[PDB]
Design a protein around this ligand. Sequence first.
Ligand code: SF4
Lengths: 628, 290
Amino acid sequence: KAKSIDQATLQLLDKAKQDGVETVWDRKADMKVQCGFGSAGVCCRNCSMGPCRVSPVPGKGVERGICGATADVIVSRNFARMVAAGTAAHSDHGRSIALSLYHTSKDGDIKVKDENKLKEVAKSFNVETEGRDIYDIAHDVAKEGLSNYGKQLGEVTLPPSLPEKRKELWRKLGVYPRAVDREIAAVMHSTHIGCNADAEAMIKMSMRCSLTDGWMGSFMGTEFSDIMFGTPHSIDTEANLGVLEKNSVNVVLHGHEPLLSEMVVEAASDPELVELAKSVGADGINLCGMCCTGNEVSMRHGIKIAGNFMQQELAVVTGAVDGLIVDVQCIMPALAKLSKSYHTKFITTSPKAHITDSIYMEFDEENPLDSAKKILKEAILNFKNRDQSKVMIPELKCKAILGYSVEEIINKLDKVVNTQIGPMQTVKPLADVLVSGVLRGAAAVVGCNNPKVVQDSAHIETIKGLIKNDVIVVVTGCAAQAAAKYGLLQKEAAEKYAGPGLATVCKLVDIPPVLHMGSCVDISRILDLVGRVANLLGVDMSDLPVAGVAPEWMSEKAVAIGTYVVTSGIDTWLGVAPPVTGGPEVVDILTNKMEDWVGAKFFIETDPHKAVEQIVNRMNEKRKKLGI
Amino acid sequence: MNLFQTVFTGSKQALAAAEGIVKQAVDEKGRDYKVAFPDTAYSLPVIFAATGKKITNVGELEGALDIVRSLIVEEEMLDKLLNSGLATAVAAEIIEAAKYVLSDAPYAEPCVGFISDPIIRSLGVPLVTGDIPGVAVILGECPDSETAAKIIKDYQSKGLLTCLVGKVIDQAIEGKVKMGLDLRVIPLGYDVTSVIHVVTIAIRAALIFGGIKGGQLNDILKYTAERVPAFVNAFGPLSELVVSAGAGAIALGFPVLTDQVVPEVPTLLLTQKDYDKMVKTSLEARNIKI
Ligand code: SF4
């Protein structure tokens, strides 16, 4: 099987073979046939009476663990713990953002750059704004956001875009969210030996936990990031490994937390550091981003995107990365080993993510700019250790357009609003094109890479099929970066891949057929958008012809995302089977009974063409239900 | 019934009416009997633009229903909707041709029916010059004669060439609107199919001024969209046939504005209840400068 559809990826894999270094593909091959029990989710290790493995085939072999737990119980608890872990990752990201908001000041390193956005958020949090200092408002907003994480009395605060009907449905179902850390703790408590042994209740607890990710953690992280670093607008950038410069210092930012990458971008324009880069013999400083931190700095500043998850190692294989600065999440620990074969400084900066044999330079949030300058100076000084004979940068990079926040999308939609009719600054043109049938629907393509799928193949095939069927596509994360590398994030792509209705819409609004809405936490934006559409049409989000796809997901964060997208009322297709096939009841809940609960359900489909067909059929049947 | 289904239903009704009237013409006059429009050089302009074929006898008119049949594909995608609008336009043209071959004088005053080529050439000079900054196709009935007269005279005072289809003709007559080719208020006919008589004005504008040869349908549609500043104001309740004819106008690149609640399409299908702002809304939608 081919390892990737990306030619630059293939060239660097040949180079890695020539250099005698191992990749994620090599380790996947070394793992050989993976354990069937773990793959089906019928293995349990929740107590030291175990490990227990029960048969993935009902009626045969061992039926219960030592405590008496069935295959359905073991599967449901394993799934719930994946959701809890994903929720924890996203919530910790949002908590750091809220703490940064709490420390903003007029003369400090972290300021308020979008005051209108802050005032609207303050309105959503019942924070007074009129005749008040902007930083007093910011601190009050940060306090309310922080209380969302750990309040023990009262109800949490949810964005106004969430329909009232969806909230009432959640309350009736028993999944209405509480404080984020409280829900994570509840899931961890109920999976403990001898607690919850009922699959339906376990799945409902996991949905309840995932809601605190989708609508509170990721949402607050995104909106506070907009407040502090600016709301994204349409902006040009370049993507894929070709963005590395042979004659410049190459600094690659990998990870998820945006404050460090924002401070690194600011430090790169420091005159002393630019002079130092010139003095070490480089033309300048070339900042490139990877994964979600790359998505953030690219959405807000046009920083070039070096690559997505399964390309991180190959970035080092070029031999041109002088510094690789990482914060947390989706940072392959093998990088520490791999950087030994090159001059690259692999720099960890977060106390949450220590990696053995990496260079640890703790990013100081109290003095973010000075700390970022010190880290960047280490990366620049490493340019003297470059071995130019080992350098091979593929001449493969692609132009991309991104920055499509909800605000930017609304601004673009204002173009097709007749001034004599109005209203302006709404999602009404999008609702109109969806209701009329010019657009069949909207689909979110999100998720990681996975060695189980030819890298980027499923993302590209799913996106092309959807836009060919007049389904407008919004992309986040590594899927968005796969689209960027391929060339879908271009206005020209409208006439090259889209169907007639979507091509007309793209021409009228002057947008690409695929809209890059940011990082994984920025999936909250997608929720926001859908909610607005629903609130404009007076229906629940489960009545709309919308869907989400995770063609190549790998992370626990992806599991939590799919869970809260389904719980919000949006059908979700998974291109990689989650470890639930061992529990028939869990499969039936996720793919059949969930529709009775929340009006949406999971679809497991490993063939992208079949997934596109199923998405189109499901959207059409929801349209016929809605009468459009 | 959604927009696509409404357009498909309208196109099927137009096809049924065309089949009935063609059967009547075949029964009364014979398949060798001549089929023509008064003083034109492009036979039936819509069929000539779509295929290049000139319809000369009744048998060929009966064979032209296959064009309407092939232009109706009931799949909910935008291209099929535009093709279905074009099917309605072809069916309306066939109905008008059958009217002309059945009756010696199908239209009486003030209705003018078909517009001859010399009138098109006369209007071409002020069209490109800018003395005619647009073509207002008014179809249906306004709630009052006063509002219809007000809108029509507002268009007239701005130099636009306004064409009238339906009961709006009677409302304008009650409103003391002075009509004629020099007064730029042209009543086409009381039936919806009479709207084709302004559609052929645009089509022949591509045939005469644009120089596009017959059968180059995409070139004709591009020319009408980028050169002919026409728009539709549909007043009063809209049947499926009216919506299908509006889909044809959209296929020609002409935006359709109405006072009725319809599934809106930005820049193409717009609802404007306020009759005091309909003229400005249409001028903005068609990008017309006075
Ligand atoms: S919780 Fe039950 S099934 Fe799991 S390891 Fe312990 S005894 Fe075995």
